[PDB]
Amino acid sequence: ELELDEQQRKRLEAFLTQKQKVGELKDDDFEKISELGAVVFKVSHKPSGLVMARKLIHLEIKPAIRNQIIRELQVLHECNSPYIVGFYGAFYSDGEISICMEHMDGGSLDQVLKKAGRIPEQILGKVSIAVIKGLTYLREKHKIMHRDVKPSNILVNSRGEIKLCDFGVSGQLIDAMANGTRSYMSPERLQGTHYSVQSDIWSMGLSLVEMAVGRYPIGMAIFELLDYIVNEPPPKLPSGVFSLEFQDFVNKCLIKNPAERADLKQLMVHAFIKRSDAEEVDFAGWLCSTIGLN
Amino acid sequence: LDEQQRKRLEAFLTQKQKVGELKDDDFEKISELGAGNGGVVFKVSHKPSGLVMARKLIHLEIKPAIRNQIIRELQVLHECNSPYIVGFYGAFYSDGEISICMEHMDGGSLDQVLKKAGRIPEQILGKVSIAVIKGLTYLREKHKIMHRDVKPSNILVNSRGEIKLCDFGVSGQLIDAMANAFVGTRSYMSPERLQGTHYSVQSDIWSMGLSLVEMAVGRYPIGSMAIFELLDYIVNEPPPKLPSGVFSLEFQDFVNKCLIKNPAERADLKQLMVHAFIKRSDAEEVDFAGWLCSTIGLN
Amino acid sequence: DWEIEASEVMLSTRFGTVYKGKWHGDVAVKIPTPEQFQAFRNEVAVLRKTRHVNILLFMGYMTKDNLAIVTQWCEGSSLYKHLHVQETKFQMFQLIDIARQTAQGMDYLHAKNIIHRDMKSNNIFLHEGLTVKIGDFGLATVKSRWSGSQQVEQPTGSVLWMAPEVIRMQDNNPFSFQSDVYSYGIVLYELMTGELPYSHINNRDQIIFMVGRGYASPDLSKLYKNCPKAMKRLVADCVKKVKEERPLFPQILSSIELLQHSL
Amino acid sequence: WEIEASEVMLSTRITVYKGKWHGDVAVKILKVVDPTPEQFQAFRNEVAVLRKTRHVNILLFMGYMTKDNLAIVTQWCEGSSLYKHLHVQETKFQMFQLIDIARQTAQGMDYLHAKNIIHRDMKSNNIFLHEGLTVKIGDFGLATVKSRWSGSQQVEQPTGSVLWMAPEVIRMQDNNPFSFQSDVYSYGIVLYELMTGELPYSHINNRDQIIFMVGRGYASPDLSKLYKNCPKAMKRLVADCVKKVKEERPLFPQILSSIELLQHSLP
Ligand SMILES: CNS(=O)(=O)Nc1nccc(Cc2c(C)c3ccc(Oc4ncccc4F)cc3oc2=O)c1F
Ligand SMILES: CNS(=O)(=O)Nc1nccc(Cc2c(C)c3ccc(Oc4ncccc4F)cc3oc2=O)c1F
Ligand SMILES: Nc1ncnc2c1ncn2[C@@H]1O[C@H](COP(=O)(O)OP(=O)(O)NP(=O)(O)O)[C@@H](O)[C@H]1O
Ligand SMILES: Nc1ncnc2c1ncn2[C@@H]1O[C@H](COP(=O)(O)OP(=O)(O)NP(=O)(O)O)[C@@H](O)[C@H]1O
Ligand SMILES: [Mg+2]
Ligand SMILES: [Mg+2]
């Protein structure tokens, strides 16, 4: 599952090579190009010529904590996978933490959903494989879960790649950012139970229902949403539209009990994944056609 | 002094013997006699002695050392005992105000009396002149002190017919402290003191003459002009004079000799005491007490 | 009236971040529908009603270019920065003094029917380490006879200081004097523990759910042993889950003054 | 801004009381039960001036009480007036502190004039050093708001302290001799107090003589008594603010600019 084909291995080696040309990141080395959303800018690193995405985070914390966050963020230099957004570096300037990462010209699947209305099932089958493989990579190779899986944190590009981003690689940053109108949190995490990658699987199933039906599928204020997640049954795909294997896939992702919920190994050999993995789908074509790219 | 004056001066000192350390909590307000630029005066009753006093209060923001020097310099008033000087009981500090307790004159000041009477007859002013000249002489001979602030509000009278001076410059630190004051309305400063040249009791004589004119005609005679214009008139314009034929020629020569702008050419206390106006006034048997009581309302 | 000509105000440094300036000395300035004019009017109208040493001094408003509100520039740091960033060591009498001055300004606000609605240690400035200044009235409002009629929007601030009924948003207008008191109680917790509440919870939605459901509340065992028992009761009373049981600021002032006379 | 009289407690008399209204306050109450129509207009004008001031160097106005006796409520400053520090307690200020007091006072005056407020009674006693740190300009009982017809109306006689009055205000040869420059002069005398530790004309102990000699131009503050520490730019500023000629005196925007420049290069 963490084995790369020839094309993915060459793409990963090429990214590392381009990453070699990048040295110490300074605020002056960057030129703002546009705003991708929020804050995150599409920027240019003048010494290297590389296009990057620069996320800025403002925190009022002790300087020692800020430095440890920068040290914990360095672990992203080891997170190299076809299903993980690449990382260039992270630094501090003007009171804001700058996280500089691979630029994804397709944006987030939250953005793709707005331009598509709803995302087809075969496309979502390729998305499910990517998220599952990305969650597997993080667990097997780095012993961390994601903690914030949702459509805005699944990025895509015109090469057909699908990658996770904004996972909890820095414990100090997780604690600092504990201070959104929707929510993709699992029931067990809302109630203060200990949690695992199982809660990411719930978050993925919830995101799949949203992208499939083109609607956030809960129900309204934030508390009533969280009350609905904990005390009401999970959502489900409509019965007539989507295949039975896709319906069973999300249902096993949305079981409220995390132990009875399916794990990554179960999901990887699920019939919905077997079928979508064998299907030849032109994701890059669909993406560029859906967004209006070249 | 005469027999009546000596008897009264001993009666004052005898009552003063019953007054000791002055404290604020021992005083009881009775009325408000007045309030001027520097401070305010109340009629009080010293409850231990059961006496009636006039408690002037002067507000000053000064160092504690300066206020004690003022209290020490005011103790010289214990030695200023004269029928033409207001008596002294004691001076202390309290609540940011120096309290000068003195003799109560139930007739008030000649400023209040002039307001009720309108004009003060020449025969009364003869008695007032004698009182001022003798008070200025006592202060210069027994204490080497000029008054520095002669005006109708600082000439006090009582129902017994006594006329006395008050509020004279006995404390050099109090004089310097009260120079930081607000702008006033009237002025009785001599021309030489205004211009800053040398001055003596001749300035108190100029102020007396001006005060005589104010009480005789019934109106402040300088000049509605502002305080500065009044000072320029005093310095640069000739002095005021009594009207043509309303008074005797002696009062007019006495006033005109008091108001000569040149202090050296101006009459002194010796010349004034032997002046025709003073000799005639000292011979008259005027009943000053009846005039005051019937004019003010005392009975 | 209180309008400032835009040509006079100078900007220097940077509803956003910082904006230090200079208009008759150091000042602080702020960065489009009829709703946002109501936002400017409500903040300006509240500010115009405040003249109290523990309330940030409103100085004037502007309209030209971008809308602006001009206030005094406080010298120093915020209470948040003093407690959680610089770790300024305050003595217990200084902590009780900060608690008193804050209650003084809040009592002034409520007495004029002001609901701050966004009280937190980030909006309490320690002017020169001496005088508490309550600021950031962007969410403030005056209590009126139609306040319950209007549907408020979600506070979208920090959940740490929000009262449970403000989190639940079950009523049209959950804000009140007692919701300000709860926020003040959390500030007391910061003063008397040195920590933010819910240190063990690193999940915003978990805080929203458990506090809204009553399953979570500040840990009173984290209060200093140096903290008087009356102060400990005051913190507990101010963060009561039941709105009506929370004391009002006249009671807060009486309680602090008594334990201060004691010390 | 009216305050209900039940809400205010009066604790200590210093008429002025240290009171309690949402904390310590100062309450200046006029103890007169038959308010003359002149006392009325004076109360309303002072409230009207205070109503326009929102600045850190102006004593904070908080409200007025009309029931019972007329009164004005302000913040209670902790500390002493500049007069008390300089001439009573003889506080030993460093030169940079003295210059900082000069700067903060010019700051508040520059705010007042920008709102067309003439103080008309600027003196050491009306500057309060709150917490030892911050200047608070107070006592607006003589303050006025400049208008179109203000400069031509005949104002009443001046009744304030002589030491700080501009020569043209003493002379009263104009209908209204007050202006921005007369406040500047008064501020200059405050500078003279800061930079010498003494009041002007200490050799003249005659009230009327000071009036006459300042009015005629014969007397002026003795600049030789300025401290040795006092920077020359500060000495020239004292001399500029005290110039006998009205139009020669600088305005507070220039006063502030000069003091700020000097503070940037001072140790
Ligand atoms: C809602 N769930 S939660 O309550 O658990 N909160 C949190 N969830 C998850 C994470 C965090 C903190 C955090 C964040 C936000 C973060 C963002 C970007 C980042 O850069 C890259 N990321 C991936 C690939 C390449 C990169 F360059 C690293 C980050 O690392 C982090 O640790 C949370 F606070
Ligand atoms: C306008 N001329 S000026 O400018 O020279 N100013 C001054 N003139 C004159 C004097 C002073 C100061 C002064 C004053 C005011 C004073 C007042 C009352 C006092 O009590 C009694 N007095 C007499 C008899 C009994 C008393 F109980 C003693 C006083 O002793 C004083 O020294 C001045 F400041
Ligand atoms: N590497 C990237 N390449 C392209 N677009 C990006 C990249 N990183 C972020 N973005 C975009 O920037 C937007 C803002 O990101 P972010 O600040 O994480 O908000 P978010 O994803 O919606 N999660 P949240 O902050 O909780 O709302 C995302 O929704 C993406 O569309
Ligand atoms: N010993 C006294 N007995 C009775 N009345 C007195 C006495 N001393 C003063 N007064 C009255 O109190 C008033 C106030 O006096 P004072 O405080 O000296 O101001 P003033 O002399 O009238 N004018 P000014 O010198 O400018 O303050 C006087 O005018 C008298 O009427
Ligand atoms: Mg994201
Ligand atoms: Mg007198």
PDB file of C-alpha atoms and ligand atoms in Angstrom, chain A residues 36-38 40 53 55 85 101-104 107-108 111 148 150 152-153 155 166, ligand 3:
ATOM      1  CA  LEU A  36      -5.223  31.152  -2.308  1.00  0.00           C
ATOM      2  CA  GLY A  37      -7.617  31.666   0.623  1.00  0.00           C
ATOM      3  CA  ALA A  38      -7.752  31.723   4.431  1.00  0.00           C
ATOM      4  CA  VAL A  40      -2.427  31.159   2.510  1.00  0.00           C
ATOM      5  CA  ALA A  53       2.149  28.148  -0.919  1.00  0.00           C
ATOM      6  CA  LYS A  55       0.543  29.716   5.118  1.00  0.00           C
ATOM      7  CA  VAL A  85       1.617  17.695   0.393  1.00  0.00           C
ATOM      8  CA  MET A 101       4.690  23.951   1.266  1.00  0.00           C
ATOM      9  CA  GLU A 102       4.178  22.482  -2.182  1.00  0.00           C
ATOM     10  CA  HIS A 103       1.742  24.532  -4.279  1.00  0.00           C
ATOM     11  CA  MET A 104      -1.288  22.548  -5.480  1.00  0.00           C
ATOM     12  CA  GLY A 107      -6.773  23.781  -4.829  1.00  0.00           C
ATOM     13  CA  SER A 108      -8.730  21.979  -2.124  1.00  0.00           C
ATOM     14  CA  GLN A 111     -13.068  24.408  -3.841  1.00  0.00           C
ATOM     15  CA  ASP A 148      -8.224  17.450  10.776  1.00  0.00           C
ATOM     16  CA  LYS A 150     -12.009  17.414   5.695  1.00  0.00           C
ATOM     17  CA  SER A 152     -10.459  21.737   2.466  1.00  0.00           C
ATOM     18  CA  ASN A 153      -7.438  19.679   3.631  1.00  0.00           C
ATOM     19  CA  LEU A 155      -5.508  19.094  -2.143  1.00  0.00           C
ATOM     20  CA  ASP A 166      -2.612  20.354   7.593  1.00  0.00           C
TER      21      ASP A 166
HETATM   22  N1  LIG E   3      -0.519  24.035  -0.733  1.00  0.00           N
HETATM   23  C1  LIG E   3      -1.639  24.632  -1.146  1.00  0.00           C
HETATM   24  N2  LIG E   3      -1.855  24.754  -2.477  1.00  0.00           N
HETATM   25  C2  LIG E   3      -2.975  25.351  -2.894  1.00  0.00           C
HETATM   26  N3  LIG E   3      -3.972  25.867  -2.166  1.00  0.00           N
HETATM   27  C3  LIG E   3      -3.732  25.729  -0.863  1.00  0.00           C
HETATM   28  C4  LIG E   3      -2.631  25.149  -0.266  1.00  0.00           C
HETATM   29  N4  LIG E   3      -2.717  25.177   1.113  1.00  0.00           N
HETATM   30  C5  LIG E   3      -3.868  25.780   1.326  1.00  0.00           C
HETATM   31  N5  LIG E   3      -4.532  26.142   0.189  1.00  0.00           N
HETATM   32  C6  LIG E   3      -5.828  26.816   0.086  1.00  0.00           C
HETATM   33  O1  LIG E   3      -5.933  27.782   1.118  1.00  0.00           O
HETATM   34  C7  LIG E   3      -7.215  27.666   1.764  1.00  0.00           C
HETATM   35  C8  LIG E   3      -7.095  28.124   3.195  1.00  0.00           C
HETATM   36  O2  LIG E   3      -6.480  27.056   3.957  1.00  0.00           O
HETATM   37  P1  LIG E   3      -6.617  26.906   5.523  1.00  0.00           P
HETATM   38  O3  LIG E   3      -6.063  28.099   6.204  1.00  0.00           O
HETATM   39  O4  LIG E   3      -5.985  25.606   6.029  1.00  0.00           O
HETATM   40  O5  LIG E   3      -8.191  26.845   5.761  1.00  0.00           O
HETATM   41  P2  LIG E   3      -8.998  25.504   5.700  1.00  0.00           P
HETATM   42  O6  LIG E   3      -8.318  24.518   4.813  1.00  0.00           O
HETATM   43  O7  LIG E   3     -10.426  25.798   5.151  1.00  0.00           O
HETATM   44  N6  LIG E   3      -9.074  24.812   7.223  1.00  0.00           N
HETATM   45  P3  LIG E   3      -9.663  25.918   8.352  1.00  0.00           P
HETATM   46  O8  LIG E   3      -8.613  26.963   8.601  1.00  0.00           O
HETATM   47  O9  LIG E   3      -9.965  25.135   9.688  1.00  0.00           O
HETATM   48  O10 LIG E   3     -10.980  26.577   7.765  1.00  0.00           O
HETATM   49  C9  LIG E   3      -7.589  26.198   1.596  1.00  0.00           C
HETATM   50  O11 LIG E   3      -8.994  25.982   1.670  1.00  0.00           O
HETATM   51  C10 LIG E   3      -7.030  25.867   0.209  1.00  0.00           C
HETATM   52  O12 LIG E   3      -7.994  26.107  -0.810  1.00  0.00           O
END
